Amino acid sequence: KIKPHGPLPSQTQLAYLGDELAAFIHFGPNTFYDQEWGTGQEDPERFNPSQLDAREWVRVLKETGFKKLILVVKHHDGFVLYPTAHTDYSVKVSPWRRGKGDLLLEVSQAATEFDMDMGVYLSPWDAHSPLYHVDREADYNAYYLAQLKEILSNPNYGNAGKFAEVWMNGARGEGAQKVNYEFEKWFETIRDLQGDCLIFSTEGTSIRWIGNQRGYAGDPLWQKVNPDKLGTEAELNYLQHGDPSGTIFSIGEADVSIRPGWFYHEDQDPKSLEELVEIYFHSVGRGTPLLLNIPPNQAGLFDAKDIERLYEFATYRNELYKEDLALGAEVSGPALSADFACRHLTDGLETSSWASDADLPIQLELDLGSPKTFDVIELREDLKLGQRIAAFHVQVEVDGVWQEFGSGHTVGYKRLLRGAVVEAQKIRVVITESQALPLLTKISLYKTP
Ligand SMILES: CC(=O)N[C@@H]1[C@@H](O[C@@H]2O[C@@H](C)[C@@H](O)[C@@H](O)[C@@H]2O)[C@H](O[C@@H]2O[C@H](CO)[C@H](O)[C@H](O)[C@H]2O)[C@@H](CO)O[C@@H]1O
């Protein structure tokens, strides 16, 4: 029994890491006003999608491999997209669904049908609320809290009444009131109603921002931080790389829009497959989830181009992973014991892993038995026992010379590392720095389609 190392992830954290792909939905007055930020002066009469179909949103997301859907139900403009008891600035005063509309309900019903996990984004900064003022901040905090209770206590909201993530955006306009939030109170309520539900915030919660909206996790990416170095003034590079000395397990979620903007704009186009693939390799392929925003249009529908792109992106990933070229390769090198043997890295069993207490560098060598053509290696740690590896490199034997394939810092939950396409039978993975005796659960090899 190897001892754990460092801060360990919760079950809900590991489940997210396992799921890899989440979808964001920004939709609201901003969609009708052709803007990215609203003022709270938007006319609810203009919130009037011609033919909204949340079931179609959920179906396409499910079919294209997304495992969670995070819905904006109140952006910075403050317009609430479910019939809240706590402000009149909501869908209640919109003509949509002859005034009886509830977008949270509509998305929740569809998500429940498709077993799509649910997140909810409720903007802390509220440009509409007359309570959003330093002189009224206790009242604003009670407003926000009361809405968390409305959202998170209702069996008709979420995936069968369950929410997997709450999103508290850190953004605030320069001229806005400097309201301070009752974070701990909010977190307690979230726990009371939804247990270990993940929380994205500027504070020391289970999810942090990766520090850009480009889909780029750093290398290294430590999925752990010290809460004392977070808050609204957290350094972006700290978010992006995490902390080798972090004290809490923290997922650096990589959010990015399929378009330039978060809301739908007719004049904008979605990213290319090539662009999404790069993002994929620098987010999921660096051990963190990708949260990809798809904005519905003024009809309440996903854009046709955007839909095509999600299917092409899904096809790409299915083809990448179709064959693990490393399965059954003979693996040699040091190993702690038979229970942690090298052959565990390519045996195709999720239940078996490798470890070694040998002095670094530790060299694992795979012999594929015959020459194969590949351009991706996948490594995974056992984060139930903590993140450990700080540096590694990969080589391939070509005409009797061990040439470089690639190098990196961290592995984490899952690390994809691309190299130039090669035909080779023998590969070395060399671990050169680690915070504790290294473990890997798998080595895989693929060819990009
Ligand atoms: C329009 C725009 O680019 N705004 C960004 C801010 O993004 C916010 O978050 C995204 C997801 C979207 O809802 C925007 O309308 C929001 O304004 C950005 O705020 C940071 O956003 C990240 C998430 O990407 C975390 O929530 C941070 O805590 C926020 O500080 C700010 C600063 O990067 O830049 C523009 O205002």
DSSP 8-state class, residue 274: H
Report DSSP letters for 179-248, one per residue.
Answer: ----HHHHHHHHHHHHTT-EEESSSSSSEEE-S-SBS---SS--SEE-GGG-STT--HHHHHH--TT-SE
Residue bearing tokens 């350094």 = 235
Distance CA 446, CA 449 (A): 9
> What secondary structure letter does DSSP report for 136?
G
Q: Which fold has domain 330-446?
A: Jelly Rolls (2.60.120)
The annotation status of 102 as a binding-site residue, yes or no, is: no
Q: DSSP 3-state assignment of 41?
A: coil
90: DSSP letter = B
Give the torsion sign (CA, 133, 137, 140, 145).
Answer: positive
The H or E element spanning position 407 is: strand 401-408
**Residue listed under structure tokens 């929410």:** 163
- Distances 264 to 31, 66, 172, 189, 259 between C-alpha atoms, Å: 6, 20, 21, 33, 8
Using the 8-state DSSP alphabet, how is residue 428 labeled? E
What end-to-end distance do the CA atoms of the chain give, in Å? 40
Query: Contact at 8 Å (CB) between 438 and 431?
Result: yes
Q: Give residues with Cβ within 8 angstroms of 142, minimum separation 6.
A: none
Residue of the CA atom closest to atom 7 of ligand 1: 171
- Known binding residue 349? Answer is yes
347 assigned to a ligand binding site: yes
Task: Report residue 90 CA to chain centroid gap.
Answer: 29
Q: 8: annotated binding-site residue?
A: no
Pocket test for ligand 1, best of 169, 230, 233, 251 (most atoms within 8 A of CB): 169
d(CA 393, CA 83): 55
Domain edges within the chain = 11-321, 330-446
What is the CATH number that goes with domain 11-321? Answer: 3.20.20.80
Q: Hey, is 49 helix, strand or coil? A: coil
**Cβ-proximal residues to 322 (8 Å cutoff; 6+ apart), any chain:** 449
The DSSP string of 156-193 is TSSBTTB-SEEE------TTS------HHHHHHHHHHH
Consult the annotation and say whether 441 binds a ligand: yes
Distance 50 CA to ligand 1 centre (A): 28
Look up residue 47 and give its amino acid. Answer: F
* Resolution of the model in angstroms: 1.7
- Nearest alpha carbon, ligand 1 atom 36: 171
Using a 10 angstrom Cβ sphere, with 0-12 exposed, 13-18 middle and 19 or more buried, the burial of residue 15 is: middle
Question: For atom 19 of ligand 1, which residue has the closest CA?
Answer: 171
Q: How far is the CA of 130 from the centre of ligand 1 (A)?
A: 23
| In the block, residue with structure tokens 């565990």 | 344
Q: Are 23 and 268 in contact (CB under 8 A)?
A: no
Compute the chain's Rg from CA coordinates. 23
For residues 31 and 296, the answer to whether their CB atoms sit within 8 Å is yes
| Cβ-contact 217, 227 below 8 angstroms | no
Cβ–Cβ under 8 Å, residues 223 and 181: no
Give the three-class secondary structure for 366. strand
Residues 397 and 324: beta-carbon distance below 8 Å: no
Q: If 0-12 CB within 10 Å is exposed, 13-18 middle and 19+ buried, where does residue 51 land?
A: exposed
β-strands 251-257, 290-293 pairing: parallel
Q: Please give all residues whose beta carbon lies within 6 A of any atom in ligand 1, as ranges.
A: 36-37, 169-171, 202, 209, 213, 255, 262
Q: How many angstroms separate the Cα of 408 from the Cα of each of 17, 115, 320?
A: 20, 36, 21
Which atom belonging to ligand 1 lies closest to the Cα atom of 123?
13
β-pair type (415-434, 389-398): antiparallel
Residue 39 CA to residue 42 CA, distance in Å, equals 7
Ligand 1 mutation pick, 205, 213, 257, 293, max ligand atoms within 8 A of CB: 213
> From the CB of residue 403, how many other CB atoms can be counted at a distance below 10 Å?
13
Q: Which residues contact 267 (CB under 8 A, 6 or more apart)?
A: none
The ligand 1 atom nearest the CA atom of 257: 11
